[PDB]
Scaffold this active site. Sequence first.
Site, mmCIF file in Angstrom:
data_model
loop_
_atom_site.group_PDB
_atom_site.id
_atom_site.type_symbol
_atom_site.label_atom_id
_atom_site.label_comp_id
_atom_site.label_asym_id
_atom_site.label_seq_id
_atom_site.Cartn_x
_atom_site.Cartn_y
_atom_site.Cartn_z
ATOM 1 N N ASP A 26 149.499 -14.520 53.097
ATOM 2 C CA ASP A 26 150.403 -13.803 52.212
ATOM 3 C C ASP A 26 151.843 -14.015 52.663
ATOM 4 O O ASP A 26 152.182 -13.780 53.823
ATOM 5 C CB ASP A 26 150.027 -12.318 52.240
ATOM 6 C CG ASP A 26 149.948 -11.693 50.866
ATOM 7 O OD1 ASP A 26 148.821 -11.448 50.384
ATOM 8 O OD2 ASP A 26 150.992 -11.398 50.262
ATOM 9 N N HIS A 29 154.859 -13.675 49.994
ATOM 10 C CA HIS A 29 155.556 -12.680 49.186
ATOM 11 C C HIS A 29 157.071 -12.851 49.265
ATOM 12 O O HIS A 29 157.809 -11.953 49.664
ATOM 13 C CB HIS A 29 155.139 -11.270 49.590
ATOM 14 C CG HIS A 29 153.838 -10.846 49.001
ATOM 15 N ND1 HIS A 29 153.399 -11.295 47.777
ATOM 16 C CD2 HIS A 29 152.876 -10.020 49.466
ATOM 17 C CE1 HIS A 29 152.223 -10.759 47.512
ATOM 18 N NE2 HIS A 29 151.881 -9.983 48.523
ATOM 19 N N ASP A 44 149.692 -15.544 46.977
ATOM 20 C CA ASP A 44 150.593 -14.395 47.032
ATOM 21 C C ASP A 44 151.998 -14.817 47.451
ATOM 22 O O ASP A 44 152.575 -14.268 48.386
ATOM 23 C CB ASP A 44 150.062 -13.310 47.974
ATOM 24 C CG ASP A 44 149.032 -12.393 47.322
ATOM 25 O OD1 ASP A 44 148.655 -11.379 47.929
ATOM 26 O OD2 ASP A 44 148.561 -12.681 46.217
ATOM 27 N N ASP A 94 156.219 -12.009 45.036
ATOM 28 C CA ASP A 94 156.618 -10.685 44.574
ATOM 29 C C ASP A 94 156.898 -9.804 45.775
ATOM 30 O O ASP A 94 156.616 -10.199 46.908
ATOM 31 C CB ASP A 94 155.569 -10.041 43.679
ATOM 32 C CG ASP A 94 155.945 -10.118 42.216
ATOM 33 O OD1 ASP A 94 157.134 -9.902 41.900
ATOM 34 O OD2 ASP A 94 155.061 -10.407 41.385
ATOM 35 N N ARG A 95 157.440 -8.611 45.545
ATOM 36 C CA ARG A 95 157.764 -7.684 46.623
ATOM 37 C C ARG A 95 158.695 -8.323 47.643
ATOM 38 O O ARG A 95 158.619 -8.037 48.838
ATOM 39 C CB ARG A 95 156.499 -7.157 47.301
ATOM 40 C CG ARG A 95 155.681 -6.250 46.410
ATOM 41 C CD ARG A 95 154.192 -6.433 46.625
ATOM 42 N NE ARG A 95 153.428 -5.288 46.133
ATOM 43 C CZ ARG A 95 152.100 -5.230 46.088
ATOM 44 N NH1 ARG A 95 151.371 -6.255 46.506
ATOM 45 N NH2 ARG A 95 151.497 -4.144 45.624
ATOM 46 N N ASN A 151 146.597 -13.555 43.888
ATOM 47 C CA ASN A 151 146.589 -12.419 42.979
ATOM 48 C C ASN A 151 147.889 -12.301 42.203
ATOM 49 O O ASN A 151 147.883 -11.958 41.019
ATOM 50 C CB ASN A 151 146.312 -11.146 43.769
ATOM 51 C CG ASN A 151 146.890 -11.199 45.159
ATOM 52 O OD1 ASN A 151 146.182 -11.480 46.127
ATOM 53 N ND2 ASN A 151 148.165 -10.890 45.282
ATOM 54 N N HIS A 152 149.016 -12.610 42.840
ATOM 55 C CA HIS A 152 150.322 -12.450 42.219
ATOM 56 C C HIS A 152 150.801 -13.704 41.519
ATOM 57 O O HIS A 152 152.010 -13.923 41.417
ATOM 58 C CB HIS A 152 151.347 -12.007 43.257
ATOM 59 C CG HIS A 152 151.214 -10.577 43.654
ATOM 60 N ND1 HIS A 152 152.153 -9.925 44.419
ATOM 61 C CD2 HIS A 152 150.247 -9.670 43.393
ATOM 62 C CE1 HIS A 152 151.773 -8.677 44.610
ATOM 63 N NE2 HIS A 152 150.618 -8.496 43.998
ATOM 64 N N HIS A 163 142.628 -16.939 49.088
ATOM 65 C CA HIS A 163 143.224 -15.624 48.953
ATOM 66 C C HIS A 163 142.153 -14.640 48.525
ATOM 67 O O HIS A 163 141.132 -15.012 47.956
ATOM 68 C CB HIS A 163 144.361 -15.658 47.938
ATOM 69 C CG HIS A 163 145.095 -14.365 47.800
ATOM 70 N ND1 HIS A 163 145.404 -13.561 48.871
ATOM 71 C CD2 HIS A 163 145.589 -13.740 46.708
ATOM 72 C CE1 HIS A 163 146.052 -12.492 48.442
ATOM 73 N NE2 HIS A 163 146.176 -12.576 47.133
ATOM 74 N N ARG A 209 141.216 -1.165 44.904
ATOM 75 C CA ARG A 209 142.346 -1.829 44.274
ATOM 76 C C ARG A 209 142.231 -1.813 42.760
ATOM 77 O O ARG A 209 143.248 -1.783 42.062
ATOM 78 C CB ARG A 209 142.452 -3.261 44.781
ATOM 79 C CG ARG A 209 143.864 -3.703 45.057
ATOM 80 C CD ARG A 209 143.885 -5.132 45.536
ATOM 81 N NE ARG A 209 143.342 -5.261 46.878
ATOM 82 C CZ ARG A 209 144.047 -5.672 47.921
ATOM 83 N NH1 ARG A 209 145.319 -5.999 47.766
ATOM 84 N NH2 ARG A 209 143.479 -5.763 49.113
ATOM 85 N N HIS A 252 144.857 -11.331 52.083
ATOM 86 C CA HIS A 252 145.219 -10.539 50.928
ATOM 87 C C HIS A 252 145.762 -9.171 51.254
ATOM 88 O O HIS A 252 146.488 -8.613 50.429
ATOM 89 C CB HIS A 252 144.015 -10.380 50.001
ATOM 90 C CG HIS A 252 144.347 -9.755 48.693
ATOM 91 N ND1 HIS A 252 145.519 -10.021 48.017
ATOM 92 C CD2 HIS A 252 143.662 -8.870 47.936
ATOM 93 C CE1 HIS A 252 145.540 -9.313 46.904
ATOM 94 N NE2 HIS A 252 144.423 -8.614 46.827
HETATM 95 MN MN LIG Z 1 149.746 -10.042 49.083
#
Ligand SMILES: [Mn+2]
Lengths: 62, 60, 41, 114, 293, 55
Positions: free
Chosen positions: E56, E58, E84, E87-88, E116-117, E166, E213, E240
């Site tokens: 991850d 991000h 991933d 984002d964030r 996932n993102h 992931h 989740r 993840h």
């Molecule tokens: Mn993540």
Amino acid sequence: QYTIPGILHYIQHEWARFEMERAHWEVERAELQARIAFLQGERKGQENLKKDLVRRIKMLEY
Amino acid sequence: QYTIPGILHYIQHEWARFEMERAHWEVERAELQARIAFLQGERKGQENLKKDLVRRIKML
Amino acid sequence: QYTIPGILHYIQHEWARFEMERAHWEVERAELQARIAFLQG
Amino acid sequence: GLPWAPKVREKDIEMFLESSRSKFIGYTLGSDTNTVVGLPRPIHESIKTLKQHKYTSIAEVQAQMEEEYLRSPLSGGEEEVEQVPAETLYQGLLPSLPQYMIALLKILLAAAPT
Amino acid sequence: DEKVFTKELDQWIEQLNECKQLSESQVKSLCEKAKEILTKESNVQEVRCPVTVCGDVHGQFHDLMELFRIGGKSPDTNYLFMGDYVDRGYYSVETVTLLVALKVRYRERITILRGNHESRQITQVYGFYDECLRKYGNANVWKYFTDLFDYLPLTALVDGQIFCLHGGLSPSIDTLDHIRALDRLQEVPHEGPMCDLLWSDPDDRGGWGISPRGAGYTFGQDISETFNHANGLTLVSRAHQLVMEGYNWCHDRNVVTIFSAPNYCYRCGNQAAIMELDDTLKYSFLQFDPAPR
Amino acid sequence: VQTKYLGRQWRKSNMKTMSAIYQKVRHRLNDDWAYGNDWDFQAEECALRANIERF
Ligand SMILES: [Mn+2]
Ligand SMILES: O=P(O)(O)O[C@H]1[C@@H](OP(=O)(O)O)[C@@H](OP(=O)(O)O)[C@@H](OP(=O)(O)O)[C@@H](OP(=O)(O)O)[C@H]1OP(=O)(O)O
């Protein structure tokens, strides 16, 4: 020795290469238009400053 | 609606389009090359002109 | 209306279609010849 | 554990392939599982993985031979069948099979625990 | 026609290494090339012996630079990023641009997996849309990058015995043949095998479970053990969920989780970690902390 | 074979049985038992019946 798999691979690859070359030429044309605009601005600035200089020179003539 | 006559007309018209389009590309390309060549020459001439002008300003 | 993968897929399918049509017609011809010779006998 | 090697019947291959055709070629073809040319490579990969895990059982080929016979009856379609004991037993049962089955089930239901 | 765009790409990467983004036209041509490259990759990719797995990220671009500083530069060290990306984090655009630029340039030395993102919905919600707009005043970028995310391979298989992905694994999936038999060219569906590969995660409760989740499941130990044995894998690696240590060994050395974004959850203040698979497939971990701002 | 028509809620309620189904039963590729979304009985019958009687 014509084989439909060969023909189809050829059609696919040649359409793809035309697309690639299309993108190439279009990018080059964009860059060239930008350069034209730049040279237009430069010519305009040069002509303007030259007009102002010769106007001051003509004022000296007066 | 797919069919062999339509596909053949499609390929013919599309190949013709690609060829005439590459032709227009080449003519416009040479045109733009010569155009920027002329405009760069004009910029160089105006540069020599401004040099001569500052020279005459110092002279007068 | 069209699309290149569409064209390629359609060409391939038409070729396979003709091949299946040939097989079917061969079987039909076998059958008809069979009935023919049967009636002949 | 996972002891079973996966299987995939032809129907699944055709269904998946037609889904992909509708999604990527804009038109479904219909019950054809060899035309894969316009689909992207990550789809050819899936098609190969499927068709290499295919499992065609005797039932499918037997139904195929049956519809075949029914198509072309007398162009050599007349076949001989082995008289293996199962076949003779079926030849015996065939006349009044449903009564046999109903009777067996009646006895069963009478013999269920409750 | 070949070395020219190679030089162009190298210049792009150099520019990117200074938090200096690209023009949307550059991003467009880049995403086209990356689509062309990714389309030749199965849903389960194979990577040769020595690699460096990272999880991850991000969008923490400066921490990605710190990572590169820890584990080596781009072409020298083979990398494997398990999703991933965006984002964030504030520098989402720069992060994904750099990773894609690498993947296009050194298509053999780096491999990036879907996450996932990477679906349009999650980006539109969590921020990648907002940064695309702020930094570009458009959605054309966020369109290109999503139409590219729809091609990333779902999983990777290092030396045929390490499974990297992931998220985690799913009940609709029993063997790598099954994954390789999917259709990954679509947006992440809400329920399927895809919405579990990129959403599930191990746990304590054996067998399948319900993921708090909301998507995917929580495969217990026995699930992972039987999966490994039935596929010959020696270890399944994933990234993840936050792990403050940097990397966790869940399910008795069967599953590894390797978060590689330091100080992600600030109340926790984690340290990132990456894994090195050397010439003999022996893993060795490197834990690092956020860059000096 | 019938878990698809049992509704998501049922799947969400019974997992131990879904875990067992995962382990024991053979897996079909591209099967959708674990995430299934969703018939003419007499008609399908009377068609199969015709096939049988023809044979
Ligand atoms: Mn993540
Ligand atoms: O385990 P599967 O791959 O699903 O095998 C099943 C079936 O199993 P079930 O009846 O329990 O569903 C039979 O195998 P057995 O359980 O009897 O051992 C059967 O084999 P038989 O009909 O000879 O008994 C048949 O195999 P086939 O289709 O070749 O007849 C069939 O296979 P399918 O899954 O393809 O239906």
